[PDB]
Symmetry: D2
Subunit: 122 residues, 4 copies
């Protein structure tokens, strides 16, 4: 985990994120998107639970990206929840939630759900 | 947002979290749980998208908590995605994803989904 | 369960659904919405798992509604997953997934997630 | 849709389901699982929204399976929400919710979320 999490990751839709896993469970870095009302790099922050593992289990982690930078303000934020699996073909499997700021009347339709798999190879 | 987000929040199950919304979209603080394989305070980190809003919309935000501290290591992490609505009865409505580290065979059943509403009053 | 599930249910946003729980796990009925690109009644079909329960547990169930009737065709369908809890203040607590038909390029943003609580009283 | 939906489908974990799409939006069939506290075939029921589509969009659909048959009673039900895409390599992409019957104290952890992709080839 940590050492193996640090680095560049790519998902199936062409997005990339670079992260540094800090000794005490922190994750900091940037996310560069491929889809959405995104454009350029956005700051990402999150945490991971190291014990993590005498039965080859994954390391649980999560992070958040608010879609605002100096070129765009999409009034939304996405959170990814999943686990890191290391080795030859290390990967981070996640499920995500994207919430948009809405009026109270449209709040029932404010959150989208999806999944993404990230690899060290693109 | 920001100023109105900073402070203590409580949800329906008795959990509490104290957060500080930083000028440039950061959210940092601690979460003290009521349920789970949690015990005491855990560090939380996240982001919010300020524009946020000439049509009284909510401010989108999200944060992560890895369930590890000096008393417990639950090998899991939870991410909350939602929006802040201010005013008299300000609230943060969220949907969350809790992922546990599993072996590859049980990864299909590694993530729980739920929702939580936080208020300034408990 | 079954007998206690049969009847009319109302949720917080003003929607209503009438269902009949059949002896062998079937659920059939109609859903009349309050929000969405819905208008009138739609057919609903689903299943419930009866054992259900010497430790007052809920009865797991789920159903689907395709948003097409003789007045509207929203090209979408919603599925509700949850459990029935009987008694004085019986309720059905659910989480739902609403998927819209999209082109392959927008499929990442095709599903919304939410929750609804239904009661016998409106 | 309909005609193209009728038939046998397989997902990545080895499960199979046979479905018949009825002229008026109904879906009926059986699901034979590969994972879970499942064993054999279970009845499935659902709906699809036909318009469906002059811009090659998918057909939205959903179905439910209660995990009870003459050999097992797992006290749970799963709902799948997604869309059908036809052609050479037709597929049904879905997100699912699996709810277990729990006591009120564990209801916060009663629902698992995941995704599955089904193809006509296994």
């Amino acid at each position: 985990a940590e050492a193996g999490i640090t680095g560049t990751w790519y998902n199936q839709l062409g997005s990339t994120f670079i992260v540094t896993a800090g000794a005490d469970g922190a994750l900091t870095g940037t996310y560069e998107s491929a889809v959405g009302n995104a454009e350029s790099r956005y700051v990402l922050t999150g945490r991971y639970d190291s014990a993590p593992a005498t039965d080859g289990s994954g390391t649980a982690l999560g992070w958040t990206v608010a879609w605002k930078n100096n070129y765009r303000n999409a009034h939304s934020a996405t959170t990814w929840s999943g686990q890191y699996v290391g080795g030859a073909e290390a990967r981070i499997n996640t499920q995500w939630l994207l919430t948009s700021g809405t009026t109270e009347a449209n709040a029932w339709k404010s959150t989208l759900v999806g999944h993404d798999t990230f690899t060290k190879v693109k």
